[PDB]
C-alpha cells in the first residue's frame, strides 16, 4: 500500500511529512486549474475531516486564499492529526475562514466543493451527519473535486461504505488505488489524475498490482519480421460449438486471425462447422462427426491428433454443458500437452483437479457467474475479488482472467487491471472474440499472462473505436475494429 510508501518516504528517506502534505495539496490546486481553467472566478467550499486527508484539504484552501473569489472550510472532524493541525493553523494565520457546522444552504454560495473528508483512512460505514453532508453534496449539482479518493469509497476494494461522494475530478497521490480502478468506486472517482508528490521512484515501482496501459501493451506486441511466413506467427486449434451454439467458433477463430495468427483451425460438430467458412473462408473448419451434435469422448482421439500440429488450443465457447461434454473436456485437458485457453462451457464442466495435474500452461477466462460456479461461491463474493482470483491462479498454476467492466488478469504473483472497453461488450459474442485473441497471442510467442494482458486491453479499446452508439456494437463489428486498435497502439 501507499500507506507503507508514505511511511518509508518519511521514516527512512527523511522527507518531512509536512512536505508530502504540501505537495499533495498543491497538486490538487494545479489539477483543478487544468480542469476548470483560471480559478479566480470560482468560489470554493472545502470539506475537511480531522485526518491527513483533511490536512491536504487545508493546504488546498490555504493555497486558494487571496487568489480565488471565495474560500470557506467546513471542518467536520473532532480531533486533528499533527499535520492536519499544522495546516489548519497555517490556513487561519493566512486569514482563512473555518466553520464547524455544515448548513445545507451553504452549498448555494459556492461553485466548487473540495471533498477532503475521508481518504484511505476510512474505516467502516459512513453514517450520521457525515452521511447527510455527503448526500447534500451529491444532490447539489456543484463541481466536486475529491482529495485522494472520494470520501466513502474503500480504497482497497472500490466498495461504497454506505454512502460516498460522487466526484467530477479525483486527485490521488503516487499511484492509483484499487478503489479508483474497481467499481463502484471507479464510477464515483470521475476523472482521475495521479500526482507525483515526491515519493522515491523505486517505491512507486515496488507496487505489485498495475493498471494495463497503452505503453505496456505496445512494448508487449510481438514483432513482425519482414522475412516471415505463416508458421512464424503460430497455429491455433479452437474446439468449440454444438448444434445449439453454431456461432461461437466463428467469433473465436476470427479473434485469433485479427490479432495476427498465422493459421487457425476450428473443430466443430458437422454440419455446424460449415457456418464458419461461409462467413470467413480464411478459417479452416474441420467437421467433427458426433452422435447428437455435441462433443463427447468419441471425439477425444481426433481432437488430440488435431492438437499435435498446433501451438495452442482454445476450448469451450458454444460446447454446451452436459455430461458427455464434461467427460470429453476433462479427459482432453488432462491429456493435452499444449497451452490451453479455457472459456465458457469448458469452465462450467471443468474439474479443477485437472488443472493442477497439467504440466502445460492454461488461461481461464470466466465472467463472475462462471467463476462463482467454478469455486462454488456467490457472484457477489467473487465479483472484483482480486485476492480470490490471485489464490485461485496460484493454487491451480494458471492465469485467471476474471471478466467485468474492469477485468482482472493474474497469475497469482502479478495482477493487472484492465479499464478499456464500454457496455457494447455486454452482449453475447464478446467473450468468444477475446478467447481467440488470447490463443492467438500465445501462438505468436507471448506468455499466457502477456497474451492475456495485451488481449484484454485491445479487446476493450476496439470496442471504444466503434463509431456509432456503443449499445449497438456486436462481436462482428468488434472483430472489424481489432486491427485499428492495434494500429492506434502504435
Amino acid at each position: 500500500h501507499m500507506k507503507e510508501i508514505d511511511e518509508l518516504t518519511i521514516k527512512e528517506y527523511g522527507v518531512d511529512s509536512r512536505i508530502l502534505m504540501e505537495r499533495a495539496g498543491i497538486s490538487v490546486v494545479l489539477a483543478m486549474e487544468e480542469e476548470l481553467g483560471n480559478l479566480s472566478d470560482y468560489r470554493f467550499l472545502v470539506l475537511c475531516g480531522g485526518g491527513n486527508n483533511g490536512g491536504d484539504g487545508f493546504v488546498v484552501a490555504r493555497n486558494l486564499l487571496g487568489v480565488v473569489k471565495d474560500v470557506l472550510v467546513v471542518f467536520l472532524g473532532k480531533k486533528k492529526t499533527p499535520d492536519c493541525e499544522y495546516n489548519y493553523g497555517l490556513y487561519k494565520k493566512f486569514g482563512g475562514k473555518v466553520v464547524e457546522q455544515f448548513e445545507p444552504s451553504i452549498l448555494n454560495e459556492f461553485d466548487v466543493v473540495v471533498d477532503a473528508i475521508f481518504g484511505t483512512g476510512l474505516r467502516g460505514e459512513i453514517t450520521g451527519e457525515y452521511a447527510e453532508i455527503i448526500n447534500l453534496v451529491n444532490k447539489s449539482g456543484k463541481v466536486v473535486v475529491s482529495v485522494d479518493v472520494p470520501s466513502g469509497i474503500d480504497s482497497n476494494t472500490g466498495k461504497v461504505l454506505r454512502t460516498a461522494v460522487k466526484a467530477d475530478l479525483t486527485v490521488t497521490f503516487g499511484v492509483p488505488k484499487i478503489g479508483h480502478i474497481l467499481f463502484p468506486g471507479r464510477d464515483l472517482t470521475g476523472k482521475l489524475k495521479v500526482a507525483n508528490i515526491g515519493h522515491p521512484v523505486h517505491l512507486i515501482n515496488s507496487i505489485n498490482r498495475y493498471v494495463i496501459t497503452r505503453e505496456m501493451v505496445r512494448s508487449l506486441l510481438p514483432e513482425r519480421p519482414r522475412d516471415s511466413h505463416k508458421g512464424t506467427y503460430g497455429k491455433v486449434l479452437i474446439i468449440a460449438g454444438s448444434r445449439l451454439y453454431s456461432g461461437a467458433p466463428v467469433l473465436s477463430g476470427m479473434g485469433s486471425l485479427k490479432v495476427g495468427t498465422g493459421l487457425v483451425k476450428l473443430a466443430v460438430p458437422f454440419p455446424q462447422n460449415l457456418i464458419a467458412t461461409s462467413r470467413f473462408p480464411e478459417l479452416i473448419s474441420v467437421p467433427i462427426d458426433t452422435e447428437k451434435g455435441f462433443f463427447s469422448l468419441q471425439n477425444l482421439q481426433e481432437c488430440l491428433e488435431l492438437s499435435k500440429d498446433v501451438d495452442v488450443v482454445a476450448i469451450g465457447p458454444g460446447l454446451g454443458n452436459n455430461e458427455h461434454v464434461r467427460e470429453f473436456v476433462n479427459e482432453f485437458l488432462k491429456t493435452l500437452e499444449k497451452p490451453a485457453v479455457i472459456d465458457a462451457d469448458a469452465i462450467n464442466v471443468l474439474d479443477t483437479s485437472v488443472l493442477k495435474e497439467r504440466k502445460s500452461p492454461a488461461v481461464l477466462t470466466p465472467h463472475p457467474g462462471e467463476m462463482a460456479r467454478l469455486v462454488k461461491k456467490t457472484v457477489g463474493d467473487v465479483k472484483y475479488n482480486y485476492e480470490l482470483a490471485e489464490e485461485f491462479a496460484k493454487e491451480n498454476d494458471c492465469v485467471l482472467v476474471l471478466k467485468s467492466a474492469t477485468t482482472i488478469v493474474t497469475d497469482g504473483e502479478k495482477t493487472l487491471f484492465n479499464i478499456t472497453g464500454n457496455t457494447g461488450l455486454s452482449k453475447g459474442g464478446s467473450g468468444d472474440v477475446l478467447t481467440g485473441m488470447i490463443a492467438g497471442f500465445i501462438a505468436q510467442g507471448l506468455s499466457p499472462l502477456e497474451a492475456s494482458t495485451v488481449s484484454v486491453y485491445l479487446h476493450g479499446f476496439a470496442a471504444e473505436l466503434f463509431e456509432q452508439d456503443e449499445r449497438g456494437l456486436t462481436a462482428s463489428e468488434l472483430l472489424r475494429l481489432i486491427p485499428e486498435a492495434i494500429r492506434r497502439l502504435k
Binding site: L30, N38, V67
Partner: peptide
C-alpha cells in the same frame, strides 16, 4: 496563472 506569472 496560479503557479506562474509570465
Amino acid at each position: 496563472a496560479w503557479l506562474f506569472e509570465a
